[PDB]
Short mmCIF file of C-alpha atoms in Angstrom, two decimals:
data_model
loop_
_atom_site.label_atom_id
_atom_site.label_comp_id
_atom_site.label_asym_id
_atom_site.label_seq_id
_atom_site.Cartn_x
_atom_site.Cartn_y
_atom_site.Cartn_z
CA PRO A 574 82.23 78.42 70.63
CA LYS A 575 83.83 80.90 69.72
CA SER A 576 82.32 83.63 71.74
CA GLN A 577 82.75 80.80 74.16
CA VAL A 578 86.24 79.82 73.50
CA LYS A 579 87.18 83.43 74.10
CA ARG A 580 84.71 83.27 77.55
CA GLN A 581 86.88 80.62 78.63
CA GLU A 582 90.11 82.12 77.96
CA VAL A 583 89.58 85.21 79.51
CA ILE A 584 87.81 83.46 82.59
CA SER A 585 91.14 81.68 83.00
CA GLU A 586 93.23 84.90 82.26
CA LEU A 587 91.45 86.68 85.44
CA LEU A 588 92.23 83.55 87.47
CA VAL A 589 95.93 83.09 86.40
CA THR A 590 96.84 86.72 86.87
CA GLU A 591 94.99 87.01 89.99
CA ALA A 592 97.20 84.20 91.35
CA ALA A 593 100.03 85.97 89.85
CA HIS A 594 98.96 89.26 91.67
CA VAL A 595 98.47 87.09 95.10
CA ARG A 596 102.06 85.77 94.60
CA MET A 597 103.55 89.35 94.10
CA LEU A 598 102.02 90.44 97.26
CA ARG A 599 103.36 88.22 99.27
CA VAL A 600 106.57 88.42 97.93
CA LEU A 601 106.48 92.08 98.60
CA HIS A 602 105.30 91.40 102.07
CA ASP A 603 107.88 88.44 102.88
CA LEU A 604 110.91 90.22 101.15
CA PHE A 605 110.60 93.92 101.83
CA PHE A 606 107.62 94.63 104.25
CA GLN A 607 108.18 92.20 106.89
CA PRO A 608 112.26 92.19 107.16
CA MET A 609 112.01 95.77 107.03
CA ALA A 610 109.84 95.72 109.84
CA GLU A 611 112.52 93.59 111.55
CA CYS A 612 115.51 95.64 110.61
CA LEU A 613 113.86 98.89 111.70
CA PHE A 614 114.74 100.72 108.63
CA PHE A 615 111.78 103.29 109.62
CA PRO A 616 109.71 103.22 112.55
CA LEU A 617 106.68 101.03 111.93
CA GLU A 618 104.30 104.00 111.99
CA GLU A 619 106.27 104.90 108.48
CA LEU A 620 106.40 101.72 107.28
CA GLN A 621 102.74 101.59 107.56
CA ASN A 622 101.81 104.31 105.47
CA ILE A 623 104.54 102.93 103.15
CA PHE A 624 102.57 99.46 102.71
CA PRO A 625 98.96 100.92 104.08
CA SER A 626 97.51 97.54 104.61
CA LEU A 627 99.45 94.93 102.97
CA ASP A 628 98.05 92.15 105.24
CA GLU A 629 94.76 93.02 104.50
CA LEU A 630 95.27 93.62 100.77
CA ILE A 631 96.90 90.15 99.90
CA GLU A 632 93.79 88.76 102.20
CA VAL A 633 91.06 90.45 100.07
CA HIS A 634 93.20 89.12 96.50
CA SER A 635 93.47 85.82 98.44
CA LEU A 636 89.75 85.21 99.09
CA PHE A 637 89.02 86.48 95.45
CA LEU A 638 91.70 83.63 94.30
CA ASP A 639 90.11 80.56 96.55
CA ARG A 640 86.60 81.47 95.21
CA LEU A 641 87.79 81.64 91.72
CA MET A 642 89.89 78.19 92.28
CA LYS A 643 86.81 76.98 93.91
CA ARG A 644 84.30 77.11 91.29
CA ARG A 645 86.94 76.14 88.74
CA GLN A 646 87.32 73.14 90.38
CA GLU A 647 83.91 72.04 90.60
CA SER A 648 82.50 73.12 87.14
CA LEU A 649 84.34 74.42 81.30
CA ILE A 650 82.36 76.69 83.52
CA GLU A 651 79.02 78.78 83.04
CA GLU A 652 78.60 81.39 85.90
CA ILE A 653 81.06 83.42 87.30
CA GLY A 654 79.11 86.39 87.91
CA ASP A 655 78.08 85.40 91.05
CA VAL A 656 81.63 85.38 92.19
CA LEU A 657 82.46 88.36 90.83
CA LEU A 658 79.92 90.21 92.70
CA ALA A 659 80.96 88.63 95.62
CA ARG A 660 84.15 90.42 95.60
CA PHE A 661 83.22 93.76 94.00
CA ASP A 662 79.73 94.18 95.04
CA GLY A 663 77.71 94.97 98.36
CA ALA A 664 79.56 94.86 101.79
CA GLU A 665 82.67 92.91 100.21
CA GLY A 666 82.90 95.05 97.35
CA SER A 667 82.91 98.13 99.72
CA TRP A 668 85.71 96.56 101.59
CA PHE A 669 87.90 95.60 98.90
CA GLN A 670 87.50 99.22 97.40
CA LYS A 671 88.49 100.72 100.90
CA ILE A 672 91.62 98.30 101.39
CA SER A 673 93.07 98.53 98.02
CA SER A 674 92.33 102.38 97.89
CA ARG A 675 94.12 102.66 101.50
CA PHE A 676 97.45 101.15 99.36
CA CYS A 677 97.19 102.60 96.37
CA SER A 678 96.71 106.45 97.67
CA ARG A 679 100.64 105.97 98.92
CA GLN A 680 101.95 104.53 96.25
CA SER A 681 104.11 107.93 95.10
CA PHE A 682 104.54 108.56 98.81
CA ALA A 683 106.05 105.05 98.98
CA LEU A 684 107.99 105.22 95.80
CA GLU A 685 109.76 108.42 97.04
CA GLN A 686 110.04 107.51 100.54
CA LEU A 687 111.83 104.42 99.51
CA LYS A 688 114.12 106.23 96.91
CA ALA A 689 114.99 108.65 99.26
CA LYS A 690 116.32 106.03 102.00
CA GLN A 691 118.09 104.17 98.94
CA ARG A 692 120.05 107.31 98.40
CA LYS A 693 120.52 108.50 101.78
CA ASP A 694 121.49 105.25 103.64
CA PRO A 695 123.72 102.97 102.16
CA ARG A 696 122.62 99.87 104.41
CA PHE A 697 119.15 100.06 103.37
CA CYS A 698 120.40 100.33 99.69
CA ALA A 699 122.35 97.22 99.94
CA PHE A 700 119.39 95.65 101.60
CA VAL A 701 116.74 96.33 98.84
CA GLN A 702 119.41 95.53 96.12
CA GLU A 703 119.73 92.26 98.06
CA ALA A 704 116.22 91.53 98.29
CA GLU A 705 115.65 92.27 94.51
CA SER A 706 118.62 89.60 93.46
CA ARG A 707 116.27 86.77 94.75
CA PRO A 708 114.51 84.48 92.57
CA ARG A 709 110.83 85.18 94.12
CA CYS A 710 111.08 88.56 92.98
CA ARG A 711 111.04 87.49 89.37
CA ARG A 712 113.07 90.36 87.96
CA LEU A 713 110.74 92.54 89.33
CA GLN A 714 112.30 95.44 91.39
CA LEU A 715 110.73 97.15 94.71
CA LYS A 716 109.69 99.95 92.48
CA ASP A 717 107.64 97.84 89.96
CA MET A 718 105.98 95.55 92.80
CA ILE A 719 104.25 98.59 94.49
CA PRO A 720 102.65 100.15 91.61
CA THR A 721 101.00 96.83 90.65
CA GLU A 722 97.81 97.17 92.69
CA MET A 723 96.68 100.32 90.74
CA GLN A 724 97.82 98.34 87.55
CA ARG A 725 95.69 95.17 88.66
CA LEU A 726 92.64 97.77 89.61
CA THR A 727 92.87 99.18 85.99
CA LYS A 728 92.72 95.75 84.50
CA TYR A 729 89.52 94.08 85.92
CA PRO A 730 87.01 96.09 83.99
CA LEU A 731 89.15 94.77 80.99
CA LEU A 732 88.69 91.21 82.10
CA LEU A 733 85.24 91.59 83.23
CA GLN A 734 83.98 93.31 80.18
CA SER A 735 85.10 90.65 77.61
CA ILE A 736 83.79 88.15 79.71
CA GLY A 737 80.61 89.75 79.89
CA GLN A 738 80.51 90.46 75.95
CA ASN A 739 81.07 86.87 75.57
CA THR A 740 78.33 85.36 77.95
CA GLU A 741 75.43 84.11 76.06
CA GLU A 742 72.77 83.32 78.79
CA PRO A 743 71.29 86.71 79.62
CA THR A 744 71.23 86.70 83.39
CA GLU A 745 74.46 85.70 83.77
CA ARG A 746 75.87 88.40 81.91
CA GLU A 747 73.85 91.08 83.62
CA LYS A 748 75.85 90.09 86.63
CA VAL A 749 79.11 89.76 84.87
CA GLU A 750 78.13 93.36 83.38
CA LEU A 751 76.98 94.47 86.90
CA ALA A 752 80.27 93.37 88.20
CA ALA A 753 82.15 95.18 85.26
CA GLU A 754 80.75 98.45 86.40
CA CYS A 755 81.66 97.85 89.89
CA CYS A 756 84.96 97.64 88.86
CA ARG A 757 84.85 100.95 87.17
CA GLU A 758 83.35 102.31 90.22
CA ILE A 759 86.07 101.15 92.39
CA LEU A 760 88.67 102.20 89.90
CA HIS A 761 87.36 105.78 89.84
CA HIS A 762 86.87 105.89 93.58
CA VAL A 763 90.75 104.80 93.98
CA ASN A 764 91.83 107.22 91.20
CA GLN A 765 89.97 110.04 93.15
CA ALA A 766 91.59 109.01 96.42
CA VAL A 767 94.91 108.92 94.74
CA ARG A 768 94.69 112.35 93.71
CA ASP A 769 93.37 113.47 97.04
CA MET A 770 96.27 111.89 98.99
CA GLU A 771 98.79 113.34 96.46
CA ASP A 772 97.13 116.78 97.15
CA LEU A 773 96.84 116.32 100.49
CA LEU A 774 100.43 115.44 101.49
CA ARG A 775 101.62 118.50 99.37
CA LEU A 776 99.23 120.86 100.65
CA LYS A 777 99.73 120.02 104.03
CA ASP A 778 103.54 120.38 103.91
CA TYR A 779 102.96 123.53 102.11
CA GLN A 780 100.74 124.66 104.97
CA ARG A 781 103.55 123.99 107.49
CA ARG A 782 105.83 126.26 105.27
CA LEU A 783 102.95 129.13 104.70
CA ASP A 784 104.05 132.28 106.31
CA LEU A 785 100.86 134.42 106.93
CA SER A 786 102.36 137.24 109.42
CA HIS A 787 101.91 140.06 106.39
CA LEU A 788 98.15 139.12 105.91
CA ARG A 789 97.59 139.55 109.54
CA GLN A 790 99.54 142.89 109.99
CA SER A 791 97.36 144.02 107.10
CA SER A 792 94.34 145.87 107.76
CA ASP A 793 93.40 145.70 103.72
CA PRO A 794 89.44 144.88 104.05
CA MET A 795 90.15 142.39 100.74
CA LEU A 796 92.29 140.35 102.81
CA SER A 797 90.84 139.64 106.18
CA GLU A 798 89.30 136.14 105.43
CA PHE A 799 92.46 134.66 104.65
CA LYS A 800 93.64 135.19 108.08
CA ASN A 801 93.70 132.25 109.13
CA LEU A 802 93.91 130.78 105.50
CA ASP A 803 94.18 126.78 105.36
CA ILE A 804 94.63 125.24 102.26
CA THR A 805 95.08 121.65 103.35
CA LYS A 806 92.05 120.36 102.08
CA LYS A 807 91.49 122.50 98.72
CA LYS A 808 92.23 120.85 95.44
CA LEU A 809 95.47 121.59 93.95
CA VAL A 810 94.86 122.00 90.33
CA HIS A 811 98.41 122.94 89.05
CA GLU A 812 101.47 124.77 90.39
CA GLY A 813 104.95 126.09 89.50
CA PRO A 814 107.45 129.00 89.58
CA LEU A 815 106.63 132.08 87.37
CA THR A 816 108.31 135.57 87.36
CA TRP A 817 106.11 138.10 88.73
CA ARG A 818 106.22 141.52 87.01
CA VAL A 819 105.04 143.84 89.70
CA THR A 820 106.22 146.62 87.44
CA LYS A 821 108.17 146.79 84.09
CA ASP A 822 110.68 147.96 86.83
CA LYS A 823 110.19 145.38 89.23
CA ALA A 824 110.34 141.14 88.84
CA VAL A 825 109.32 139.10 91.65
CA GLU A 826 110.33 135.14 91.73
CA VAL A 827 107.11 133.43 92.64
CA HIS A 828 105.79 130.09 93.29
CA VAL A 829 102.18 129.79 92.22
CA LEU A 830 99.33 127.58 93.36
CA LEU A 831 96.44 127.00 91.57
CA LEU A 832 93.85 125.91 93.63
CA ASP A 833 90.06 125.49 92.88
CA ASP A 834 88.91 128.45 93.57
CA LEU A 835 92.21 130.41 94.78
CA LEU A 836 95.45 131.73 92.94
CA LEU A 837 98.05 132.17 95.71
CA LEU A 838 101.34 133.83 94.65
CA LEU A 839 103.76 132.72 97.23
CA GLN A 840 107.48 134.18 97.77
CA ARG A 841 110.14 131.59 98.62
CA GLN A 842 112.11 132.73 101.52
CA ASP A 843 114.26 129.52 102.39
CA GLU A 844 111.91 126.93 103.59
CA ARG A 845 109.03 129.42 104.22
CA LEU A 846 106.32 130.46 101.76
CA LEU A 847 105.13 133.91 102.06
CA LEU A 848 102.01 135.70 101.06
CA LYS A 849 103.48 139.43 100.59
CA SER A 850 100.93 142.00 99.70
CA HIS A 851 103.69 143.58 98.29
CA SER A 852 102.97 145.98 95.51
CA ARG A 853 104.49 149.17 94.09
CA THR A 854 99.74 147.59 99.53
CA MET A 855 97.84 147.23 96.38
CA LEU A 856 98.57 143.77 94.46
CA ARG A 857 97.68 140.95 96.75
CA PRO A 858 99.33 137.50 96.84
CA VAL A 859 96.01 135.91 97.56
CA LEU A 860 92.97 135.96 94.52
CA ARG A 861 89.62 134.67 94.42
CA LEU A 862 89.05 132.73 91.31
CA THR A 863 85.77 133.32 90.49
CA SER A 864 86.33 136.30 88.50
CA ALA A 865 89.45 135.47 86.33
CA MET A 866 90.50 136.07 83.11
CA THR A 867 93.52 135.61 81.28
CA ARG A 868 95.40 137.49 78.11
CA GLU A 869 98.39 137.12 76.10
CA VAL A 870 100.79 139.93 75.92
CA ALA A 871 101.97 140.62 72.60
CA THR A 872 105.49 141.77 73.18
CA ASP A 873 106.22 138.95 75.44
CA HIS A 874 104.80 135.31 74.22
CA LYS A 875 106.24 134.03 77.53
CA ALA A 876 104.24 136.31 79.49
CA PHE A 877 100.57 136.48 80.34
CA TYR A 878 97.92 138.96 82.35
CA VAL A 879 95.68 137.92 85.00
CA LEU A 880 92.82 140.40 85.76
CA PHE A 881 89.84 139.67 88.02
CA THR A 882 86.72 141.03 86.78
CA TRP A 883 85.59 141.59 90.63
CA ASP A 884 88.59 143.97 91.10
CA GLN A 885 87.10 147.34 91.41
CA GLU A 886 91.00 148.74 91.10
CA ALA A 887 91.76 146.02 88.35
CA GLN A 888 94.88 145.15 89.13
CA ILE A 889 96.74 143.41 86.65
CA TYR A 890 98.85 140.74 87.45
CA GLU A 891 101.72 140.14 84.65
CA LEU A 892 103.23 136.57 85.26
CA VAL A 893 105.84 134.96 82.73
CA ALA A 894 106.88 131.47 82.50
CA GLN A 895 109.80 129.98 80.90
CA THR A 896 108.55 128.55 77.63
CA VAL A 897 105.42 129.64 75.40
CA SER A 898 104.02 126.29 76.02
CA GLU A 899 104.16 126.66 79.78
CA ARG A 900 102.34 130.15 79.48
CA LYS A 901 99.92 128.65 77.28
CA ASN A 902 99.15 126.09 79.51
CA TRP A 903 98.92 128.31 82.80
CA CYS A 904 96.38 130.52 80.80
CA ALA A 905 94.52 127.51 79.90
CA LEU A 906 94.54 125.78 83.46
CA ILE A 907 93.51 129.33 85.02
CA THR A 908 90.51 129.98 82.37
CA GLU A 909 89.19 126.43 82.61
CA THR A 910 89.28 126.57 86.72
CA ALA A 911 87.53 129.78 86.59
CA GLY A 912 85.10 128.56 84.07
CA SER A 913 83.82 125.95 86.38
CA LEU A 914 83.23 128.41 89.34
CA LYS A 915 79.32 129.31 89.47
CA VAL A 916 78.32 133.11 90.32
CA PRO A 917 75.72 134.34 93.09
#
């Protein structure tokens, strides 16, 4: 006691919530995933991208539950670290990371795919509503069960920390603290994979739509690299519509992508996204960020300028947002992204 009552309370909580987590994942499989496969609402390939490796996800949380239960039955309990390391360190740690990360990365894709089906297909709408009326859902909707894996990853450090900072015996406490650290690395690697997947799917759709016919037609030297442009594997820092004032007398609606080292000024033409050099030639739509600098426009608090210190011609992009905050945010983001870039 009482470091130790708290130690036992949190070890119990870990067990009891790991069980709850297993049960929901099984509900998600039995009530949604499996019957969706059988009804074939999506081709199976699509269904697997909505629930990436649900079977094996259940298994890795299951094996964790069974070890925790095995240890609880055979002990109050001293020594839990070895069990925590057995799920979160070494080859098992790696495997749990791989499987959880596959699932979590697809969360927001899954949510949208399900939501678009419900809106579009009354059959599938009635199907989800019926599954959600069932006692085994415990009042949770399909949209609440999916995020649950990512929620649980965020919980592991909280739980392992407490246990750790309430463990008296030193070698045990090191084990627990090592497992807490493993859960932090896991959460971090998953958080990074979620962003990579979110960015990847979004940029891959932008690649499909990207029209490069003008950069190919240009024999302007500065645009010869972007031939050939492939934004697919780049980091999408921020994006949004802005109005682009090529002059005081010519405004161009543009959708701009701030990647990690390029600024892309895209023209929306129906579904397509164009990179038009259009300029009074001389103002280009794809710009290297290494040299970028933003500035306020006093006559217009919604506007800003972007200039490239490397542009021997200099070469002002006057862009305007719908609110002051939003321009403020564009300037902050541009500056900070450019600020990261090393110089030769």
